[PDB]
A paper describes a structure:
The pseudo two-fold symmetric complex is a clamp-like tetramer in which two casposase dimers hold the double-stranded target site between them, with the 5' termini of the single-stranded casposon ends emerging through a narrow slot in the bottom of the clamp. Each casposase monomer exhibits the fold expected of a Cas1 homolog (Wiedenheft et al., 2009; Figure 5—figure supplements 2 and 3), with a canonical eight-stranded N-terminal domain and a globular catalytic domain that brings conserved active site residues (E162, H232, E247) into close proximity. In the integration product complex, each dimer is functionally and structurally asymmetric with a ‘catalytic’ monomer whose active site contains the scissile phosphate group that links transposon end DNA and the target site, and a ‘noncatalytic’ monomer in which the active site is located on the periphery of the assembly facing away from the DNA. In the tetrameric complex with the integration product DNA, we observe two dimer-to-dimer interactions formed by the convergence of helix α1 (residues 59–67) and a loop (residues 39–44 between β4 and β5) from each noncatalytic monomer with two loops (residues 182–199 and 275–278) from the opposing catalytic monomer. In the casposase complex structure, the total casposase-dsDNA interface buries ~4700 Å2 of solvent-accessible surface but only two specific contacts mediate the interaction with the target DNA: between R191 and G22 (i.e., the base opposite the first C of the 5'-CGCA motif) and between R192 and G20 (the base opposite the second C of the 5'-CGCA motif). Although the only base-specific interaction is between the first C of the casposon DNA (C8) and the side chain of K238, several residues interact with the phosphate backbone (H232, R250, Y206, R280, and R287) and there are arrays of stacking interactions.
Phylogenetic analysis of Cas1 proteins suggests that they may have originated from casposons, a novel class of putative DNA transposons in which a Cas1 homolog (the ‘casposase’) functions as the transposase (Krupovic et al., 2014; Koonin and Makarova, 2017). To understand how Cas1 of CRISPR-Cas systems may have evolved from a transposase, we have characterized the biochemical properties of a casposase from Methanosarcina mazei. We show that the casposase is tetrameric when bound to its target site and can site-specifically integrate a range of substrates including casposon ends with 3'-overhangs and even short single-stranded DNA ends as well as ssRNA.
Author numbering:
A (entry chain B): 1 to 354
B (entry chain A), C (entry chain D): 1 to 341
D (entry chain C): 1 to 359
Write the structure that this text describes.
Amino acid sequence: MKLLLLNGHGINMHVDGAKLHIKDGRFSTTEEPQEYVFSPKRIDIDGIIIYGKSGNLTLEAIRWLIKHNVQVSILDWNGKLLTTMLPPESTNLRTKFAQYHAFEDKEARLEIAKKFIEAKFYKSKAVLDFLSQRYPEINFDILDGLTKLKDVKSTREILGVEGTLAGKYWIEFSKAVPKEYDFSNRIDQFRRAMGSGDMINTMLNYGYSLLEAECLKAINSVGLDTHVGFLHEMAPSKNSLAYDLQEPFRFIVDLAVISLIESGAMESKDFIRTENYNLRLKPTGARKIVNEFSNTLNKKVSYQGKESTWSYVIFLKVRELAHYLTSKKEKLDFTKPEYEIERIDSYDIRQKIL
Amino acid sequence: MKLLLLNGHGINMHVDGAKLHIKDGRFSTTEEPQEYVFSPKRIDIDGIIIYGKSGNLTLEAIRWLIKHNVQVSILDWNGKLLTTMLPPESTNLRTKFAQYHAFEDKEARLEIAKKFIEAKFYKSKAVLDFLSQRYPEINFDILDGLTKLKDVKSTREILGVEGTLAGKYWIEFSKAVPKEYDFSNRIDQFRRAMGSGDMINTMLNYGYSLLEAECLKAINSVGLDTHVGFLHEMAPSKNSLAYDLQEPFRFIVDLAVISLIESGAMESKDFIRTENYNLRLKPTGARKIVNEFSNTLNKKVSYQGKESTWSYVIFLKVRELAHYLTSKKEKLDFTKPEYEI
Amino acid sequence: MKLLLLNGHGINMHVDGAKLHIKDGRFSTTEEPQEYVFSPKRIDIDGIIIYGKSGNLTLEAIRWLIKHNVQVSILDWNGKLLTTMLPPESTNLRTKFAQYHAFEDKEARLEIAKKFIEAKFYKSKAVLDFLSQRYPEINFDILDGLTKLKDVKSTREILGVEGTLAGKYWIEFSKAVPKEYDFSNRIDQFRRAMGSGDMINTMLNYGYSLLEAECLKAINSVGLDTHVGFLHEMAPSKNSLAYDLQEPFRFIVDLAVISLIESGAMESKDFIRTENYNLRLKPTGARKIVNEFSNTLNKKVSYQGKESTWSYVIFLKVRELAHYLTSKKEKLDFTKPEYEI
Amino acid sequence: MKLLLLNGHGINMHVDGAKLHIKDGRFSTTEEPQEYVFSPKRIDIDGIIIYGKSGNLTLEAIRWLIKHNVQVSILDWNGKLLTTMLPPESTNLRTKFAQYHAFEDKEARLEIAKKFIEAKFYKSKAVLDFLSQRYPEINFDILDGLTKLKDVKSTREILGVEGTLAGKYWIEFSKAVPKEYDFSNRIDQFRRAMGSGDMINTMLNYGYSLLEAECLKAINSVGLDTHVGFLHEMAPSKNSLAYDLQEPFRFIVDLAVISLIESGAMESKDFIRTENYNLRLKPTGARKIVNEFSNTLNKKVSYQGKESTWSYVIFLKVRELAHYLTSKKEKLDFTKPEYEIERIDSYDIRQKILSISYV
DNA sequence: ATATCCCCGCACTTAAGTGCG
DNA sequence: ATATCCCCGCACTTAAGTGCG
Ligand SMILES: [Ca+2]
Ligand SMILES: [Ca+2]
Ligand SMILES: [Ca+2]
Ligand SMILES: [Ca+2]
Ligand SMILES: [Ca+2]
Ligand SMILES: [Ca+2]
């Protein structure tokens, strides 16, 4: 599988005499962005993905593309797919179908489902292990979970282990949240996180949507169906595959949230309260979260030789998952790359000793 | 139901402020290209047909059409569908999964496939009976072939009967079109319905493409998969299901083409010749077929309760297929709405 | 049917030894609100309507009320009923059943439906008349629609007449809208006004909802179901009765919309375009529409002897509907409080 | 399933900022009243039960509860339900009209009515077949009464066989209650005279008001009209449909009263006496009944796969009634789920422990 | 402690919500 | 520049939106 990913302002696609020309849109303070010239006898690209602001596609260039069996997919701002021009005869749909056979296969489904929650538990320990500055009894038990996880028979049995562990995690996380916040519990009387009335749960709920957004962008940038999950069961209006992909990356929003609390960026004027008593975010607060999420997300990580951003790593993993379905990879692992950060400067410790 | 046809060189679709600007291409001698300006939430056009050579459409334009649920189809030189840009697929994946399960089941699949061709045969005759004003041999026997369809054991066997009748159909269809139009049949030098040649064949090729487009829009609209058709054992990424659904509606194209033959609207003035000795509709010709297809598609037919347009009848027929697949409907029949005098 | 309508800040219900004390809320800038004291041996009130924000109720007062067959319904900010404490053995429900029954009877229903549309047509003239400063061809005819109405033997048939008229109304209204605004039509490609793309339509949509609220507040205040209408057919989540009651008072919104246009008060940062290309109001904008509707609604009008505000006219008119439906009144006319300037 | 009971003088419900604050009334000799604080979109309690003499509620508090789907019930000094505060009704009036349309039709109305009493009989039998440890003279009909019920051509005729069996049922039920409690017959509230308030007949009325409250919530939730019952005719503003839906679940109360009696948890300290020589429940008493009703209602029953609680089952049944009316469902039946008699315990603590601990 | 963004009907779909298990 | 306010499944409801007649 080989795709060209196009971002920024000014995505141009035209044909200067049989040679297809592609200008990736710039996002920087107006500099020189990547240019591409394709031969009508060598093009390897199986598809083009456009998560772009502005851009001009010339008619001849769309035609050339179709004639060369290049799919053109246009993503919308939210990572959700806007439209796609699929050429006749394209091994591209193999990916969506491999995914569907796998979902329909008990043995397979389970294995992939397990491969998502396995990672969640690792990243969950990493979060709470990093609570070294909030060391008052933050004790976490991951192998306990993991062992049960290796032996689970059903998909629900997974949710069981996922959940049991989750509850314990939230109790520990809460030890880092000041009393004033009123982080009562992560879930309502119906065991749902939805419709938050407290700040932290509102922060986390908005945080997670931004993560889901990336998962949507990543998935669609890879040729899979967002609606068919392995751990999460498909149902109308449920972006199930995204909900799966979120599980190995939730740690990023949990960190961002904690980072905001840590500083105290959160003010009361950042929130609003619905006629239904829910606590929504005022734009000021909505920004404070996008900005930190983007920062935590644009941190780089050492993986597969290169040092790359977390956002690229989500794409990398879903690309991996996709290949695994095709059999263009015989090993799947959302546990790698791992996460960690040493003591928040020698200052925080040396100053505290007073 | 309106379509917007774009042809010539230098076609443009840009967004100014929030309004969709559409500039038609250059093609006429001194008669200037048509200009269009569409306000947000105020667009009547069902689709867009791009038959033009040069053009430059903006990303925001594609977004503006998609959000306004306006299909953007692109053809090529001959008049066949190259690609279509349709709005995002349904969030209910049970529909697609039902469709697949039915295709998976060898027998279920065989039952659905026959239901398309069953209808195609009924409408093939219906037209030949309307063509009563040109009586020399308009008598069509479906019954003996329709009985052969009732008893076929494979999808390949269905394509065997499909063709047998298809040949006998155009053998009796010729009688309607004058000798001067040089139409023998639709078959190639080997076995194909692709490569232009005959003046009405070029008119038909374009017609079937306009119909294909509505078929995809309707397929999409319900939540089915354009690529997994029951009858057609076509290419992986080929619109097999649209090719399937084409069959019970194909008669609409045939009639629209006829509604120009005795109407004297056609002339050599709108048909450029290929260097390979084939035929291509010029913008002037293409416009006459896009408009005729549009009138013939907007003809009202008394269906269940309401006297509905043939356009809307496609939408309801594919929805029925989708409802049948999900057992929300327990009987499937593409013959149910029939054509009249 | 005698109700106690409470509203404002600091509503109070307490029992000062055997007697019920009701201290109405004060919305006014420290101006004496009404106080009520009832003996247990005499209370004519059938129900209390609390359209309050703040206030206090004691257990003794709630208990006293229930033990004296006095209903207590609390309305939420949007006009919708929040909860009602209905005493057993209370006539009160007779209203809803009369309304439910009148909708059920064919001719009975069409008789009420007609009266709603009759009044609309009249006020529709009253606006276009008032638009005398913008005299160029603002001519509108009611008498053809009024007489066609007299004999429409169907609910659908009523709508047909309402339609033709509204279409000509928005042509004359467009004769008062500056070019700078954009006002293609008042309806979309599916003949609906929902999801506006332009300014005026957005203002109208938002305006009409403020009227919808007003109708709900009144409807619930008089003890009728907001979902069962005579002209508007009940369908899930449709406030059909409010949609009916909106028609004789929509003129107030159209007035607020003209008033706003005249001032030029509407700046660009009052509107916001969505991802689906709809035009919605910013808080800044919404207030301007809210305040204008508020002033136009609070305009006093001499009715049945005492000059009363339009909001109170709405209440009085549903009061009339309730009484008509329950034989407590034989004649009904929504035209009655006519508009003038 | 949780019920917040408030008693005595000086009950208080107010909203500080966004939090609901509850203060219970004064009654305990020296022991301070209970205080509750609820965070927005974080309240687990299903209903409030005000049984307190004095106290006050703010509109913001009333609103807060409505918006958190918390039912607020008020009872008279003798346990009967004065009023309940439910969230607003369904916007699908199709279900209410489907109900009205059934009510209008005689053959239709009768069929529905009969089905309520039909179930009640089967549950009356279960209760009694459970009161089989107290075998002395307990013996019940049901089948003869079920046959009379089939024959009846009027709604009034049903109400006859309802009571004719109820009479026999209560004479039988009396064999489970000790002579000291002084339980004779029932007779609802009808003719409120001397001693028409037996110490346990009293407890039954309370339970029945809590059950009434539940049915009213379930009705409200499935968009039916509480004021249009098939079996019962009653006053215009009477919760006729609640009284109907009460019938197939009345057993839950009977069972709770019986449990409290067999426990002997009930003590003279939980009752004040009336000037017309009647009996009323004190706060301790009310608390006891509310808790044992909650316990009884939270007991599970296997129903269509899932092992669902009775509180849910009531809800499931009203929805089935609602789907039946709108023709969204073909068969109506309150007989299913059936109540089981699988808890026969004595000095058999050795195996009663090994039943749940093994499976 | 602030909101309200159609109103022809039919017969749907979609995306929020929901009351449990 | 402008958004993003869960994510156990089931089996619902509600509110919004839609493709016609
Ligand atoms: Ca159209
Ligand atoms: Ca369309
Ligand atoms: Ca509960
Ligand atoms: Ca409940
Ligand atoms: Ca609306
Ligand atoms: Ca959500």
